[PDB]
Amino acid sequence: SVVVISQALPVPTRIPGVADLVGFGNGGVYIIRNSLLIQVVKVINNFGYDAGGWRVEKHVRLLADTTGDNQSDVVGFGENGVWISTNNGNNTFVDPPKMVLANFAYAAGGWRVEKHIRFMADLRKTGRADIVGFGDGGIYISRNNGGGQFAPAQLALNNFGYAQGWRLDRHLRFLADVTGDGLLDVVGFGENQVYIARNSGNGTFQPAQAVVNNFCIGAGGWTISAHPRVVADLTGDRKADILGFGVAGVYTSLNNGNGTFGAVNLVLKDFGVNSGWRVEKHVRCVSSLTNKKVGDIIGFGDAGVYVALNNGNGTFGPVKRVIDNFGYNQGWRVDKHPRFVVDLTGDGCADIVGFGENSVWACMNKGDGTFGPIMKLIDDMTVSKGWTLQKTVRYAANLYL
Numbered sequence: 492s493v494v495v496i497s498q499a500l501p502v503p504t505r506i507p508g509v510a511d512l513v514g515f516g517n518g519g520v521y522i523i524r525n526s527l528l529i530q531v532v533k534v535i536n537n538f539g540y541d542a543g544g545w546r547v548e549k550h551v552r553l554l555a556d557t558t559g560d561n562q563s564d565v566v567g568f569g570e571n572g573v574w575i576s577t578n579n580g581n582n583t584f585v586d587p588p589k590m591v592l593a594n595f596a597y598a599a600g601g602w603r604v605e606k607h608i609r610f611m612a613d614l615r616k617t618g619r620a621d622i623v624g625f626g627d628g629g630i631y632i633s634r635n636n637g638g639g640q641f642a643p644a645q646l647a648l649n650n651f652g653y654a655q656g657w658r659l660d661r662h663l664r665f666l667a668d669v670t671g672d673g674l675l676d677v678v679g680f681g682e683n684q685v686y687i688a689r690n691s692g693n694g695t696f697q698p699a700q701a702v703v704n705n706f707c708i709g710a711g712g713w714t715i716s717a718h719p720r721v722v723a724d725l726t727g728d729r730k731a732d733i734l735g736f737g738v739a740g741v742y743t744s745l746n747n748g749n750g751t752f753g754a755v756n757l758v759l760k761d762f763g764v765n766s767g768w769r770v771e772k773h774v775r776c777v778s779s780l781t782n783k784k785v786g787d788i789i790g791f792g793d794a795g796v797y798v799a800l801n802n803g804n805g806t807f808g809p810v811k812r813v814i815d816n817f818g819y820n821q822g823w824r825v826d827k828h829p830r831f832v833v834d835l836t837g838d839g840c841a842d843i844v845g846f847g848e849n850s851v852w853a854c855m856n857k858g859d860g861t862f863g864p865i866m867k868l869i870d871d872m873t874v875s876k877g878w879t880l881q882k883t884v885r886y887a888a889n890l891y892l
């Protein structure tokens with residue numbers, strides 16, 4: 492697959508890759524490096540609930556390469572600005588973090604987790620992540636000029652902001668390449684249309700264009716509470732398509748290749764409301780599970796994990812239950828046990844990792860979208876070791892390649 496940044500998954504992971512696990516726990520930052528030694532290493536005495544007073548409801552914590560060396564850094568949008576702990580290359584990070592910009596923060600700019608979105612993204616092909624925020628006035632960017640130097644925030648576009656009516660309980664915003672030039676464009680599921688704003692590569696986005704009159708709360712009755720939507724390449728040309736988990740099942744609108752979109756089609760009669768899928772019980776993902784390197788469908792359902800494989804053109808094979816685990820029936824809960832679909836083995840076919848009640852578990856893809864047995868990774872970064880959704884943040888992330 493390709494680099495798409497979403498609200499649900501603001502830290503993209505590489506296909507192929509051997510993703511690491513990163514936890515912002517009470518006591519600070521801990522990593523599990525993907526390797527022959529599986530252990531938890533504490534790396535930063537900060538960015539934690541107790542270590543610095545970091546709060547899920549006030550602050551944002553991400554990973555991103557802010558230097559251009561393909562190593563991920565820790566990035567926190569704190570009370571009064573943006574703090575970065577850079578990767579030292581050896582499973583250590585700079586501590587204390589450095590405050591790079593007095594903006595995009597609770598008390599510097601009036602940023603609110605419940606109103607605004609903050610990402611890091613290399614928006615100008617410099618190799619380094621710029622700060623990008625969907626704020627009040629529109630989209631703001633702080634340019635990453637290297638050496639830890641971030642420029643004062645500049646308005647990238649006067650759209651997709653709270654002022655323009657954008658709401659986290661109604662609407663969705665993504666960064667994804669819809670043209671194939673490698674620049675991440677805005678894709679926004681608004682009140683009545685899906686819009687794109689083309690990335691000009693210079694810290695600005697072009698005027699919004701409506702591309703589809705569906706997939707929205709006011710067009711087709713798509714709600715945040717029942718009908719998740721994603722953007723992902725379903726054909727293998729590196730250009731992002733639209734995919735929605737609706738009522739009858741999965742609908743898509745395919746990119747024509749130039750960032751305009753096709754008609755909306757029902758392509759699979761599963762993974763929707765009518766087949767019993769529920770945002771409160773289940774996790775629904777699109778990731779590459781095969782050597783076709785396109786978006787396949789993965790659902791963590793009741794009885795286990797279900798998969799429908801993309802034929803390579805956005806049509807799908809039959810739904811198969813591939814693992815009898817990680818499901819609601821096995822006690823896995825959306826509010827307690829983070830589950831990710833990411834490559835942990837370097838073959839290009841995404842695997843499964845789940846932060847369970849007692850242990851972190853993984854289940855590896857055989858290379859063809861079928862899976863091996865469940866494997867216990869470590870007894871840490873779990874509910875029973877004091878990690879909750881309300882006080883901790885957990886990601887899969889490529890710290891290195």
Ligand SMILES: CC(=O)N[C@H]1[C@H]([C@H](O)[C@H](O)CO)O[C@@](O)(C(=O)O)C[C@@H]1O
Nearest residue numbers: 594595600601602607626627628629644
């Ligand atoms: C959340 C958010 O967007 N904050 C931004 C605000 C709002 O757009 C305006 O306060 C809307 O009135 O504008 C700034 O120029 C500012 O005043 O500091 C930049 C800041 O980062």
Ligand SMILES: CC(=O)N[C@H]1[C@H]([C@H](O)[C@H](O)CO)O[C@@](O)(C(=O)O)C[C@@H]1O
Nearest residue numbers: 650651655656657658662681682683684
């Ligand atoms: C959330 C959302 O879709 N906002 C869009 C709105 C709404 O469609 C109107 O509020 C409907 O009346 O219209 C705009 O032209 C605007 O206000 O600049 C574009 C903006 O992106």
Ligand SMILES: CC(=O)N[C@H]1[C@H]([C@H](O)[C@H](O)CO)O[C@@](O)(C(=O)O)C[C@@H]1O
Nearest residue numbers: 705710711712713718737738739742755
């Ligand atoms: C969420 C969802 O599945 N929406 C689907 C809707 C709704 O079923 C009806 O609009 C509700 O009355 O039906 C469509 O034909 C439409 O109107 O666009 C396709 C769309 O994908």
Ligand SMILES: [Ca+2]
Nearest residue numbers: 835836840842
């Ligand atoms: Ca794999």
